[PDB]
RNA sequence: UGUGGACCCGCCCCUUGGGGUGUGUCCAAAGGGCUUUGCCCGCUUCCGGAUGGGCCCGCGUCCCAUCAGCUAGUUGGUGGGGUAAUGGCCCACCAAGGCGACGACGGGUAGCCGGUCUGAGAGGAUGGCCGGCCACAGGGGCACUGAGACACGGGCCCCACUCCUACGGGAGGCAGCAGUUAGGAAUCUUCCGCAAUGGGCGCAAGCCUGACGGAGCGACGCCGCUUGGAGGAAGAAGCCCUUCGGGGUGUAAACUCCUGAACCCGGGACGAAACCCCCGACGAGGGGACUGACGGUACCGGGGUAAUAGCGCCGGCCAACUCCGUGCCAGCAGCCGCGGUAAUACGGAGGGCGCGAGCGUUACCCGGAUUCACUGGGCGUAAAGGGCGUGUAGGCGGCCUGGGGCGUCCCAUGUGAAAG
């Protein structure tokens, strides 16, 4: 199905993904379908993982399936939660 | 949108197919002319209702066969046979140009 | 390749005195002095005509010559004026004198140019705290040029920066000799710098 | 030319003449010497220019150039071709590489050694 | 039959202004007379008026030149030193407004056939509209 | 060698033949209908055209014929039969035929 | 069982096979696990979404006209077959057509694109790496199975080749990683890891993953850095030139002092927090747990030695000259041209210019080349007006008014991925 995962495009050990929805099928940095943040695991800027809760609703409501990181990072952003 | 383009009538020698003319005006790309060009498309007529001379608006169709991907939507104008006329001349000296002994 | 070799021998084929050995060419012992003719064995014939041609190429040779850079860097450097907006010889020079080594030399941290360039080198530089080893580092506006702490003791720099007390620096540069600190006011303008060279015959060289 | 005929006609775009036919017009083209005469120059000059017959990979057979003051080709001697005519013998189109294969460089050469072939000599 | 009026009246002005005439005749058309109601108010011109010779309509188009020189060759400067025809039949030339030309450096002008009518290239350019690049003049 | 996707050919060989299996009846039958018909069989007509529309929908039921493939073979199906018995006909049965 | 859906037919709304309705006929299913008597994982039919895709259309897409006529499934019908679906896609029968100088047919060459290189631009050239699409998986054909394949590590047949052959008969396909061999001027390690990102399967644990993340090799490219700094003679020795007084290399060195690449010692990463587990509802939310290939690498701190230089050129174009040797020789040579005795041109030398871990050569592309000229050229004598005419297609059209508004212009809007 249609996902919600990352893209690897930093350079050599310096590794800046991009939160994306894709197709389960195509490649890892492949073309997506809609870009939806960015995360830089070494957190070497103050902002190292912006979202989009709203795009990222809207694609987990019509079947969006996260992987385990790309999960992680979209609930440090708060895109599940509802209190 | 479907397509819809504009020619005459040239042929009805077919079973509910007409071949309709379109020509189509343009600046040349790097000489900056504004050059004529043509092309002829193979419309579907079911009740054979257009002849030629007949000017008729050519509608993208669904497939109807090979060379067919058009009908026709109706008619422009009628009965102006000095188009056909250029489109057969144009025909005419064409077989004047081989082996043929040079008569034409 | 930072040439490394003799320098007085520039200045002598340059016909002008290039100051890239700092001490002893303030003195009159510069090499300029008692043979201003070029070095070799035809130095003091008579010179031909040079072609406007070789007026351009030893024009640049001499702005160059002067930061002692490489000629690699130097078009880098004189390519990225060529796109900045503004006046290209006030932009490349402006950009030439905003190199580390270049600025080290300024505040007088150095003698010469390729004393302050070891200098950075070695570590003896520092940039708003941290330490910068790249002679190449461009300095921008706001910036705190001073010298390593735990090189503050070193007998160069002792007697260098004394020699600075008292000593009138460029306009655009701030220097407090107590802390051995500096500080990189602004973008020298054309009219700030003094240099015996026509950048105009530079654009025109790299414009053949 | 009119609008009309330039679009009519339009300009014809001339090509480019390879006077080298290394084929693949590669760098250089490997082949085996067949006769290592030597020629007279063009109209201007007289000497006794050294040439040599290569038979190349190429499936080519032709007359390269042996520069330097003196050579060691032979009968089946395989060396390196380069491309590069010589002024003053008409044919002669294509320079040997000093330095590859049965092809020594030149000795005792202390200027222009990249070419020619000719190690740094280890003065002592 | 003349293949272009238009770059035949461009001409016979081109013409009779380097032998310096007083004026110089040209037979009649609404758009030729457009075009001199420019060259006029550009002031290349002192200006036009309707005459007529032997029953035809043409235009008499009073033509401008400079001072008496000094020196050897008194011939004045030319007002019009340029008047070239442009967009030609069997080569229209057409400009949107963004790619109407800007005449010597903005000391010449450019005559253009809008839907908006004949205008100048700033005429042009103000009312917002291109078309058919009918000559140069400068 | 050796690799255990060999095990898919061997099934698709099971496969191949189970499918292969439903059609041929389908065919069969359809003719059979097709033909009764033909001669105007009124009610044994219609009837076997219920079993053949039947084995149709049921072959589309798993992967055999799926999609709108059976609908069409159903539409021919109860096309032909109608326009056949269009000699003196008058369904009887009336299996997959609305009045 | 029939929510529903499929099909025939009818009617209604739509309007090429869309939506609704009525009668008739036809069509559902799978169980499993426990925190076992209800939660979870599945199952079935239907509507919709989402993603991916098929098919069709306008326009654009190299060279030769020393290729000018081509075609019979050919062009179009009707009916049928086939498919998810239109279609001569295929078939039967009928009609006789279709296509071409606005270059058909034939021949040559070629994967296309985002872009790349180059140009003032217009343009020329190009499509490697990365991304998109397409095509192929020793050569040819074919279908099976499946949501999807006519299926690179699936199947069948023919062919070529290679290993087994108890000669009947079999087994194979690196254009996956790495590697071998051959061809060539030339192109790498039979690498470490699954830690991270991504993928398959599984409730999960977890398994698989030469996708990938890394290391290795090669100045192949780009960027950074070094081979030292400051002081040191009206100036060593050596080599050089010498109008023999001198002049050059040169502050260069020697030498004094100073910093201190390499290298030694200590510490030592970010990339990793999720999945999981507990509280809470197997939610939101909070809590803890494991997990680094690169790597003891980066980086930090301490100690610490003066510690690689090369190649091209020096007749004009083009920056830089002298001596010696050689003598139309040997040789140089991009073009113009140098050498038959006092060669700034060959070879060497001292000197000098250029660039510098590189420098030079060869090949190739754009430029300069307005030297195919659209921007931006020409034809009396430089290359170039057709031996002349008639006139076919075509290109081009005088003055006034009206309609239309195709060309043209204007506005808004959609599109124009990412990379660049
Ligand atoms: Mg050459
Ligand atoms: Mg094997
Ligand atoms: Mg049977
Ligand atoms: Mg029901
Ligand atoms: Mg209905
Ligand atoms: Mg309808
Ligand atoms: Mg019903
Ligand atoms: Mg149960
Ligand atoms: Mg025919
Ligand atoms: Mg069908
Ligand atoms: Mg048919
Ligand atoms: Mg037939
Ligand atoms: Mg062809
Ligand atoms: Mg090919
Ligand atoms: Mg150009
Ligand atoms: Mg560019
Ligand atoms: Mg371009
Ligand atoms: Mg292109
Ligand atoms: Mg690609
Ligand atoms: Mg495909
Ligand atoms: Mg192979
Ligand atoms: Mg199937
Ligand atoms: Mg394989
Ligand atoms: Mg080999
Ligand atoms: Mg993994
Ligand atoms: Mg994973
Ligand atoms: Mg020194
Ligand atoms: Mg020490
Ligand atoms: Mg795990
Ligand atoms: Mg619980
Ligand atoms: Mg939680
Ligand atoms: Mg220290
Ligand atoms: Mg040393
Ligand atoms: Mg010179
Ligand atoms: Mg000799
Ligand atoms: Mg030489
Ligand atoms: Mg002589
Ligand atoms: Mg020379
Ligand atoms: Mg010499
Ligand atoms: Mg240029
Ligand atoms: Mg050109
Ligand atoms: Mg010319
Ligand atoms: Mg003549
Ligand atoms: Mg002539
Ligand atoms: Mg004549
Ligand atoms: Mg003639
Ligand atoms: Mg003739
Ligand atoms: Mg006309
Ligand atoms: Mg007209
Ligand atoms: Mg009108
Ligand atoms: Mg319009
Ligand atoms: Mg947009
Ligand atoms: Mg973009
Ligand atoms: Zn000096």
Same mark, same amino acid.
């Given at each position: ?83 | ?104 | ?208 | ?9 339009? #300009?014809?775009?001339?090509? %480019? +003449? ?5 084929? @693949?017009? /590669?760098?250089? $083209? ?6 290592? #005469?030597?020629?007279?120059? %063009? +109209? ?5 220019? @050294?040439? /040599?017959?290569? $038979? ?69 | ?138 | ?99």
């Amino acid at each position: 199905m249609v996902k919600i995962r990352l893209a690897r495009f930093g350079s050599k050990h310096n590794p800046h993904y991009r939160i994306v929805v894709t197709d389960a099928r195509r490649k890892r940095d492949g073309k997506y379908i809609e870009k939806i943040g960015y995360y830089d695991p070494r957190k070497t800027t103050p902002d190292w993982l912006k979202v989009d809760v709203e795009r990222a609703r809207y694609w987990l409501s019509v079947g969006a399936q996260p992987t385990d990181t790309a999960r992680r990072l979209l609930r440090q952003a708060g895109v599940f939660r509802q209190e | 949108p479907k397509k819809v383009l504009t020619g005459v009538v040239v042929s009805d020698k077919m079973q509910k197919t007409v071949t309709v003319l379109v020509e189509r005006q343009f600046p040349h790309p790097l000489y900056g002319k504004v050059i004529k060009r043509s092309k002829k498309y193979l419309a579907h007529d079911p009740e054979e209702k257009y002849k030629l001379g007949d000017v008729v608006e050519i509608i993208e169709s669904r497939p109807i066969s090979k060379r067919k991907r058009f009908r026709v939507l109706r008619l422009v104008e009628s009965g102006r046979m000095d188009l056909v006329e250029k489109y057969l001349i144009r025909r005419q000296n064409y077989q004047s140009l081989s082996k043929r002994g040079g008569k034409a | 390749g930072r040439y490394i070799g003799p320098v007085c021998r520039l200045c002598r084929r340059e016909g002008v005195k290039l100051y890239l050995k700092g001490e002893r060419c303030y003195s009159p012992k510069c090499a300029m002095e008692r043979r201003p003719y070029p070095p070799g064995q035809h130095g003091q014939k008579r010179a031909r005509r040079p072609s406007d041609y070789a007026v351009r190429l030893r024009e640049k040779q001499k702005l160059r010559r002067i930061y002692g850079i490489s000629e690699r860097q130097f078009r880098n450097l004189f390519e990225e004026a060529s796109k900045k907006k503004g006046v290209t010889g006030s932009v490349f020079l402006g950009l030439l004198e905003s190199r580390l080594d270049n600025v080290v030399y300024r505040l007088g941290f150095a003698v010469s140019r390729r004393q302050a360039r070891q200098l950075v080198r070695h570590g003896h530089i520092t940039v708003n705290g941290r330490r910068v080893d790249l002679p190449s580092y461009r300095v921008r506006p706001g910036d705190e040029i001073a010298v390593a702490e735990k090189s503050r003791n070193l007998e160069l720099i002792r007697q260098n920066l004394e020699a600075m007390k008292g000593r009138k620096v460029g306009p655009w540069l701030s220097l407090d000799v107590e802390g051995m600190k500096g500080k990189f006011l602004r973008l020298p303008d054309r009219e700030d710098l003094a240099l015996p060279v026509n950048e105009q015959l530079v654009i025109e060289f790299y414009s053949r | 030319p009119t609008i009309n005929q330039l679009v009519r006609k339009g #300009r014809e775009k001339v090509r %480019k +003449k390879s006077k080298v036919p290394a084929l @693949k017009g /590669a760098p250089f $083209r490997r082949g085996v010497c067949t006769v290592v #005469r030597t020629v007279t120059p %063009k +109209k201007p000059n007289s000497a006794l220019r @050294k040439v /040599a017959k290569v $038979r190349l990979t190429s499936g080519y057979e032709v007359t390269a150039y042996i520069p330097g003051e003196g050579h060691n080709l032979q009968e089946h001697s395989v060396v390196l071709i380069r491309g590069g005519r010589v002024k003053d013998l008409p044919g002669v189109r294509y320079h040997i590489v000093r330095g590859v294969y049965d092809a020594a460089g030149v000795k005792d050469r202390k200027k222009s050694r990249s070419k020619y072939g000719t190690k740094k000599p280890k003065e002592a | 039959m003349l293949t272009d009026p238009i770059a035949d009246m461009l001409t016979r002005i081109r013409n009779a202004t380097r032998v310096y005439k007083e004026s110089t005749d040209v037979p009649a058309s609404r758009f030729k007379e457009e075009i001199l109601r420019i060259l006029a108010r550009e002031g290349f011109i002192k200006g036009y008026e309707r005459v007529d010779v032997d029953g035809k309509p043409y235009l008499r188009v009073y033509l401008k030149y400079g001072p008496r020189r000094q020196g050897p060759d008194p011939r004045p400067e030319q007002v019009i030193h340029h008047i070239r025809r442009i967009s030609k039949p069997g080569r229209r030339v057409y400009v949107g407004v963004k790619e109407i030309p800007r005449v010597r450096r903005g000391l010449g002008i450019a005559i253009l056939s809008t839907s908006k009518g004949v205008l100048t290239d700033r005429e042009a350019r103000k009312l917002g509209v291109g078309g058919e690049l009918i000559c140069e003049v400068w | 060698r050796n690799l255990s996707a060999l095990k898919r050919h061997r099934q698709s060989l099971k496969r191949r033949l189970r499918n292969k299996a439903k059609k041929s009846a389908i065919k069969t039958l359809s003719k059979k209908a097709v033909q009764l018909a033909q001669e105007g069989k009124a009610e044994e007509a219609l009837k076997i055209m219920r079993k053949a529309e039947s084995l149709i929908d049921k072959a589309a039921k798993g992967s055999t014929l799926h999609k709108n493939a059976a609908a069409r073979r159903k539409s021919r199906l109860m096309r032909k039969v109608r326009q056949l018995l269009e000699a003196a006909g008058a369904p009887l049965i009336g299996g997959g035929l609305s009045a």
